[PDB]
Amino acid sequence: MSLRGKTMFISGGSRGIGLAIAKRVAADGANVALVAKSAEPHPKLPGTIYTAAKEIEEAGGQALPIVGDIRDGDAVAAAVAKTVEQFGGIDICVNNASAINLGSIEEVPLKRFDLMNGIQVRGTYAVSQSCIPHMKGRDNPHILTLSPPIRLEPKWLRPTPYMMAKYGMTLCALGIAEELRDAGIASNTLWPRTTVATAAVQNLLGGDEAMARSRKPEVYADAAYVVLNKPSSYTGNTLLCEDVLLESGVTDLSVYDCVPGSELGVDLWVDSPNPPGYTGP
Amino acid sequence: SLRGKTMFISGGSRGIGLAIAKRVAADGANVALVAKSAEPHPKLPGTIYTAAKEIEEAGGQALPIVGDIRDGDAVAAAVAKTVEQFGGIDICVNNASAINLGSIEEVPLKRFDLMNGIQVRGTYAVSQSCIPHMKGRDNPHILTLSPPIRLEPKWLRPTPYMMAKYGMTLCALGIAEELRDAGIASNTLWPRTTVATAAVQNLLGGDEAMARSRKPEVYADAAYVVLNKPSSYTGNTLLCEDVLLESGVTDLSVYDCVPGSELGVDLWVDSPNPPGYTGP
Ligand SMILES: [Cl-]
Ligand SMILES: [Cl-]
Ligand SMILES: [Cl-]
Ligand SMILES: [Cl-]
Ligand SMILES: [Cl-]
Ligand SMILES: [Cl-]
Ligand SMILES: [Cl-]
Ligand SMILES: [Cl-]
Ligand SMILES: [Cl-]
Ligand SMILES: [Cl-]
């Protein structure tokens, strides 16, 4: 199996994890539409949708960068319609747009909350809803949402704003899995076990330094790829990247380590940097 | 007893919220109640002003406030007025709610926003604003009217509403952890059956009792039990009837609209009664 001739709609996509997923899918000769709020370069975060588009093309795919605020429902509709008029249908919807603040309810004002809820909970809903009609006909359609398993033990219910937003994304994805089961559209979530170091991290740290406790964005891209090739019956799952990769046949997870043979750190909502019983390097 | 305690409550005009407000008010409590409009609706009974009269008639003091819960500044101003008036907040009840049982295919974004706004964002805003004024107090509780989080496939629909109600609960549960040191309790409370309120009879057009449902007192009384527990009791997703049996109630039929009927179940609940309940 292969994503050749298939079309992806991805929120974000302009850097880091989203870019790596876009690139991986593009490498099979896929189409990728990517939507972001602005096309102006940021002084500290690398990339724009346009430079993302070049990288998608250089990888072997066709790119459609679209300017649109995921918090504006009309802009979302317009971006999907534009994807459909250009590529003819949607095989893959990846909800990657994100927003983060790790403060408590006492520290995170309503305006910051709305940006998180807006982009992630509302955004995942609007993007997914708008994609769904254009996915019904297709060979093996997948919605994939970049969010964590719902962990209900007290330690995990923190910090509240961000947990609400991320769990809200996952709940959207799991609900959709049930509501679209008869239509045959897969909806899954996918989350990495460690922190993922992206170029943006280097830029903000201000150095060319090794993130020894972290993994590369490829861990997410390769895991996504495996999931997007499963049958549309593989649905309603809250998946971890490394676990997905071992189940697929990868034996050596060190190829994802920023620095191999280090003690790895853990992502939020994850107990261990590696799957249970992993013995590889 | 809750004599001399002050409660702030969203969605206390009618039904369950009013029943809770009246039960708290009967101890001589202050109740500040907030709603978007004070204008009577043709079919739904009550306004904040009507509800206010009933709160006073029940034994308490009422402060009815016009405020859109979806407007952050309105929420801030509603809480400020409550504090200028009564001096401090012992109890925050998040009951403002909104419902649509359609799927993601059927519920447009504008509708989604109403549920997200009022319930998830609203519970966040109201709770956030009340919290500083609850830090000094003898036994502060936040009580959020929303269900246990159930992750089995069959509970994960309809998506839009499940997102909202579950988001409500996640907020309550997060607050529990974040405010534990302070220590303001945060719990959720949900009824096992559907609760038949005046609004339901009004929309059917007849006063005809609802054999599969319970009275809103099951909500009010269960709330009263939780709100008198120590602030150490926090982070729980509670069910009315179970709370009531735990407190010593042995006859739940007094909450039945029609005693001796086969009761229906609420969303997110398997059974109309707590496990091994063998009362009437
Ligand atoms: Cl704000
Ligand atoms: Cl824990
Ligand atoms: Cl990167
Ligand atoms: Cl784990
Ligand atoms: Cl192990
Ligand atoms: Cl509607
Ligand atoms: Cl809103
Ligand atoms: Cl099930
Ligand atoms: Cl149950
Ligand atoms: Cl039983």
PDB file of all heavy atoms in Angstrom, chain B residues 124-142:
ATOM      1  N   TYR B 124     -15.551  27.350  32.506  1.00  0.00           N
ATOM      2  CA  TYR B 124     -14.230  27.889  32.726  1.00  0.00           C
ATOM      3  C   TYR B 124     -14.272  29.331  33.234  1.00  0.00           C
ATOM      4  O   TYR B 124     -13.669  29.639  34.269  1.00  0.00           O
ATOM      5  CB  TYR B 124     -13.411  27.815  31.455  1.00  0.00           C
ATOM      6  CG  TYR B 124     -11.956  28.233  31.649  1.00  0.00           C
ATOM      7  CD1 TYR B 124     -11.008  27.305  31.973  1.00  0.00           C
ATOM      8  CD2 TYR B 124     -11.548  29.534  31.427  1.00  0.00           C
ATOM      9  CE1 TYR B 124      -9.720  27.645  32.120  1.00  0.00           C
ATOM     10  CE2 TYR B 124     -10.246  29.890  31.577  1.00  0.00           C
ATOM     11  CZ  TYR B 124      -9.327  28.935  31.942  1.00  0.00           C
ATOM     12  OH  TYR B 124      -7.994  29.246  32.099  1.00  0.00           O
ATOM     13  N   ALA B 125     -14.981  30.200  32.506  1.00  0.00           N
ATOM     14  CA  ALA B 125     -15.057  31.631  32.879  1.00  0.00           C
ATOM     15  C   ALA B 125     -15.679  31.876  34.261  1.00  0.00           C
ATOM     16  O   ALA B 125     -15.175  32.653  35.052  1.00  0.00           O
ATOM     17  CB  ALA B 125     -15.815  32.400  31.826  1.00  0.00           C
ATOM     18  N   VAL B 126     -16.801  31.222  34.530  1.00  0.00           N
ATOM     19  CA  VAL B 126     -17.517  31.422  35.773  1.00  0.00           C
ATOM     20  C   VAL B 126     -16.640  30.908  36.887  1.00  0.00           C
ATOM     21  O   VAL B 126     -16.414  31.618  37.859  1.00  0.00           O
ATOM     22  CB  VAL B 126     -18.874  30.717  35.786  1.00  0.00           C
ATOM     23  CG1 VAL B 126     -19.458  30.679  37.204  1.00  0.00           C
ATOM     24  CG2 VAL B 126     -19.854  31.400  34.785  1.00  0.00           C
ATOM     25  N   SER B 127     -16.094  29.708  36.730  1.00  0.00           N
ATOM     26  CA  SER B 127     -15.276  29.142  37.788  1.00  0.00           C
ATOM     27  C   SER B 127     -14.055  29.998  38.034  1.00  0.00           C
ATOM     28  O   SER B 127     -13.742  30.304  39.187  1.00  0.00           O
ATOM     29  CB  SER B 127     -14.885  27.694  37.495  1.00  0.00           C
ATOM     30  OG  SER B 127     -16.050  26.887  37.310  1.00  0.00           O
ATOM     31  N   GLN B 128     -13.399  30.425  36.954  1.00  0.00           N
ATOM     32  CA  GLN B 128     -12.186  31.218  37.054  1.00  0.00           C
ATOM     33  C   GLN B 128     -12.460  32.499  37.840  1.00  0.00           C
ATOM     34  O   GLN B 128     -11.669  32.914  38.703  1.00  0.00           O
ATOM     35  CB  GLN B 128     -11.658  31.585  35.668  1.00  0.00           C
ATOM     36  CG  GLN B 128     -10.508  32.553  35.713  1.00  0.00           C
ATOM     37  CD  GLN B 128     -10.014  32.922  34.334  1.00  0.00           C
ATOM     38  OE1 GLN B 128     -10.664  33.723  33.627  1.00  0.00           O
ATOM     39  NE2 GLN B 128      -8.848  32.369  33.939  1.00  0.00           N
ATOM     40  N   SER B 129     -13.573  33.138  37.532  1.00  0.00           N
ATOM     41  CA  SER B 129     -13.872  34.419  38.144  1.00  0.00           C
ATOM     42  C   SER B 129     -14.277  34.283  39.618  1.00  0.00           C
ATOM     43  O   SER B 129     -13.856  35.081  40.444  1.00  0.00           O
ATOM     44  CB  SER B 129     -14.972  35.097  37.344  1.00  0.00           C
ATOM     45  OG  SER B 129     -15.276  36.340  37.885  1.00  0.00           O
ATOM     46  N   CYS B 130     -15.076  33.263  39.948  1.00  0.00           N
ATOM     47  CA  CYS B 130     -15.461  33.012  41.335  1.00  0.00           C
ATOM     48  C   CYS B 130     -14.281  32.672  42.248  1.00  0.00           C
ATOM     49  O   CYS B 130     -14.234  33.128  43.376  1.00  0.00           O
ATOM     50  CB  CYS B 130     -16.477  31.872  41.422  1.00  0.00           C
ATOM     51  SG  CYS B 130     -18.126  32.287  40.864  1.00  0.00           S
ATOM     52  N   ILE B 131     -13.353  31.861  41.758  1.00  0.00           N
ATOM     53  CA  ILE B 131     -12.264  31.274  42.569  1.00  0.00           C
ATOM     54  C   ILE B 131     -11.486  32.207  43.533  1.00  0.00           C
ATOM     55  O   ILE B 131     -11.294  31.861  44.675  1.00  0.00           O
ATOM     56  CB  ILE B 131     -11.278  30.493  41.650  1.00  0.00           C
ATOM     57  CG1 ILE B 131     -11.889  29.110  41.336  1.00  0.00           C
ATOM     58  CG2 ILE B 131      -9.885  30.394  42.274  1.00  0.00           C
ATOM     59  CD1 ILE B 131     -11.204  28.312  40.238  1.00  0.00           C
ATOM     60  N   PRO B 132     -11.063  33.393  43.093  1.00  0.00           N
ATOM     61  CA  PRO B 132     -10.357  34.253  44.053  1.00  0.00           C
ATOM     62  C   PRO B 132     -11.172  34.626  45.282  1.00  0.00           C
ATOM     63  O   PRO B 132     -10.630  34.835  46.344  1.00  0.00           O
ATOM     64  CB  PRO B 132     -10.019  35.512  43.234  1.00  0.00           C
ATOM     65  CG  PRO B 132     -10.108  35.074  41.777  1.00  0.00           C
ATOM     66  CD  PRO B 132     -11.134  33.989  41.751  1.00  0.00           C
ATOM     67  N   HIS B 133     -12.484  34.671  45.132  1.00  0.00           N
ATOM     68  CA  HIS B 133     -13.371  35.115  46.193  1.00  0.00           C
ATOM     69  C   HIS B 133     -13.854  33.958  47.035  1.00  0.00           C
ATOM     70  O   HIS B 133     -14.729  34.139  47.867  1.00  0.00           O
ATOM     71  CB  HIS B 133     -14.559  35.833  45.560  1.00  0.00           C
ATOM     72  CG  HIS B 133     -14.171  36.973  44.669  1.00  0.00           C
ATOM     73  ND1 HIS B 133     -13.855  38.224  45.157  1.00  0.00           N
ATOM     74  CD2 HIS B 133     -14.035  37.051  43.325  1.00  0.00           C
ATOM     75  CE1 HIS B 133     -13.555  39.027  44.150  1.00  0.00           C
ATOM     76  NE2 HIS B 133     -13.651  38.339  43.028  1.00  0.00           N
ATOM     77  N   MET B 134     -13.314  32.766  46.800  1.00  0.00           N
ATOM     78  CA  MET B 134     -13.689  31.562  47.540  1.00  0.00           C
ATOM     79  C   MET B 134     -12.525  31.054  48.396  1.00  0.00           C
ATOM     80  O   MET B 134     -12.698  30.154  49.213  1.00  0.00           O
ATOM     81  CB  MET B 134     -14.096  30.436  46.566  1.00  0.00           C
ATOM     82  CG  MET B 134     -15.127  30.805  45.522  1.00  0.00           C
ATOM     83  SD  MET B 134     -15.484  29.436  44.380  1.00  0.00           S
ATOM     84  CE  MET B 134     -16.338  28.297  45.475  1.00  0.00           C
ATOM     85  N   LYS B 135     -11.338  31.596  48.171  1.00  0.00           N
ATOM     86  CA  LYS B 135     -10.146  31.238  48.934  1.00  0.00           C
ATOM     87  C   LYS B 135     -10.145  31.415  50.452  1.00  0.00           C
ATOM     88  O   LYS B 135      -9.468  30.661  51.148  1.00  0.00           O
ATOM     89  CB  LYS B 135      -8.932  31.936  48.321  1.00  0.00           C
ATOM     90  CG  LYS B 135      -8.448  31.223  47.076  1.00  0.00           C
ATOM     91  CD  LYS B 135      -7.336  31.967  46.396  1.00  0.00           C
ATOM     92  CE  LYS B 135      -6.790  31.216  45.207  1.00  0.00           C
ATOM     93  NZ  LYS B 135      -5.452  31.707  44.825  1.00  0.00           N
ATOM     94  N   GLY B 136     -10.897  32.358  50.988  1.00  0.00           N
ATOM     95  CA  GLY B 136     -10.850  32.545  52.440  1.00  0.00           C
ATOM     96  C   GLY B 136     -11.751  31.622  53.257  1.00  0.00           C
ATOM     97  O   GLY B 136     -11.591  31.508  54.468  1.00  0.00           O
ATOM     98  N   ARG B 137     -12.665  30.928  52.586  1.00  0.00           N
ATOM     99  CA  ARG B 137     -13.957  30.632  53.178  1.00  0.00           C
ATOM    100  C   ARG B 137     -13.933  29.294  53.926  1.00  0.00           C
ATOM    101  O   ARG B 137     -12.944  28.533  53.853  1.00  0.00           O
ATOM    102  CB  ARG B 137     -15.039  30.674  52.100  1.00  0.00           C
ATOM    103  CG  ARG B 137     -14.865  31.850  51.086  1.00  0.00           C
ATOM    104  CD  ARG B 137     -15.282  33.182  51.645  1.00  0.00           C
ATOM    105  NE  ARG B 137     -16.695  33.147  51.982  1.00  0.00           N
ATOM    106  CZ  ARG B 137     -17.385  34.162  52.510  1.00  0.00           C
ATOM    107  NH1 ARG B 137     -16.794  35.334  52.744  1.00  0.00           N
ATOM    108  NH2 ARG B 137     -18.683  34.002  52.802  1.00  0.00           N
ATOM    109  N   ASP B 138     -14.993  29.030  54.690  1.00  0.00           N
ATOM    110  CA  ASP B 138     -14.951  27.908  55.621  1.00  0.00           C
ATOM    111  C   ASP B 138     -14.858  26.603  54.843  1.00  0.00           C
ATOM    112  O   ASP B 138     -14.055  25.727  55.177  1.00  0.00           O
ATOM    113  CB  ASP B 138     -16.175  27.878  56.555  1.00  0.00           C
ATOM    114  CG  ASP B 138     -16.182  29.020  57.582  1.00  0.00           C
ATOM    115  OD1 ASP B 138     -15.106  29.612  57.866  1.00  0.00           O
ATOM    116  OD2 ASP B 138     -17.282  29.308  58.125  1.00  0.00           O
ATOM    117  N   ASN B 139     -15.670  26.487  53.791  1.00  0.00           N
ATOM    118  CA  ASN B 139     -15.872  25.210  53.129  1.00  0.00           C
ATOM    119  C   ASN B 139     -16.254  25.331  51.633  1.00  0.00           C
ATOM    120  O   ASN B 139     -17.273  24.810  51.186  1.00  0.00           O
ATOM    121  CB  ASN B 139     -16.947  24.460  53.908  1.00  0.00           C
ATOM    122  CG  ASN B 139     -16.910  22.985  53.645  1.00  0.00           C
ATOM    123  OD1 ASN B 139     -15.823  22.351  53.674  1.00  0.00           O
ATOM    124  ND2 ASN B 139     -18.096  22.409  53.365  1.00  0.00           N
ATOM    125  N   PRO B 140     -15.414  26.008  50.850  1.00  0.00           N
ATOM    126  CA  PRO B 140     -15.797  26.358  49.480  1.00  0.00           C
ATOM    127  C   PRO B 140     -15.957  25.152  48.557  1.00  0.00           C
ATOM    128  O   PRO B 140     -15.116  24.275  48.569  1.00  0.00           O
ATOM    129  CB  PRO B 140     -14.641  27.212  49.008  1.00  0.00           C
ATOM    130  CG  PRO B 140     -13.438  26.773  49.878  1.00  0.00           C
ATOM    131  CD  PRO B 140     -14.028  26.389  51.189  1.00  0.00           C
ATOM    132  N   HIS B 141     -17.040  25.132  47.783  1.00  0.00           N
ATOM    133  CA  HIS B 141     -17.293  24.115  46.778  1.00  0.00           C
ATOM    134  C   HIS B 141     -17.632  24.719  45.420  1.00  0.00           C
ATOM    135  O   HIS B 141     -18.409  25.668  45.337  1.00  0.00           O
ATOM    136  CB  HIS B 141     -18.516  23.281  47.162  1.00  0.00           C
ATOM    137  CG  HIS B 141     -18.218  22.128  48.059  1.00  0.00           C
ATOM    138  ND1 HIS B 141     -18.041  20.846  47.584  1.00  0.00           N
ATOM    139  CD2 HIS B 141     -18.091  22.057  49.399  1.00  0.00           C
ATOM    140  CE1 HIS B 141     -17.809  20.037  48.600  1.00  0.00           C
ATOM    141  NE2 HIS B 141     -17.819  20.750  49.711  1.00  0.00           N
ATOM    142  N   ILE B 142     -17.094  24.128  44.360  1.00  0.00           N
ATOM    143  CA  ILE B 142     -17.566  24.360  43.024  1.00  0.00           C
ATOM    144  C   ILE B 142     -18.288  23.072  42.621  1.00  0.00           C
ATOM    145  O   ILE B 142     -17.776  21.963  42.817  1.00  0.00           O
ATOM    146  CB  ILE B 142     -16.429  24.643  42.064  1.00  0.00           C
ATOM    147  CG1 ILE B 142     -15.603  25.849  42.539  1.00  0.00           C
ATOM    148  CG2 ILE B 142     -16.983  24.857  40.669  1.00  0.00           C
ATOM    149  CD1 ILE B 142     -14.307  26.086  41.720  1.00  0.00           C
TER     150      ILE B 142
END
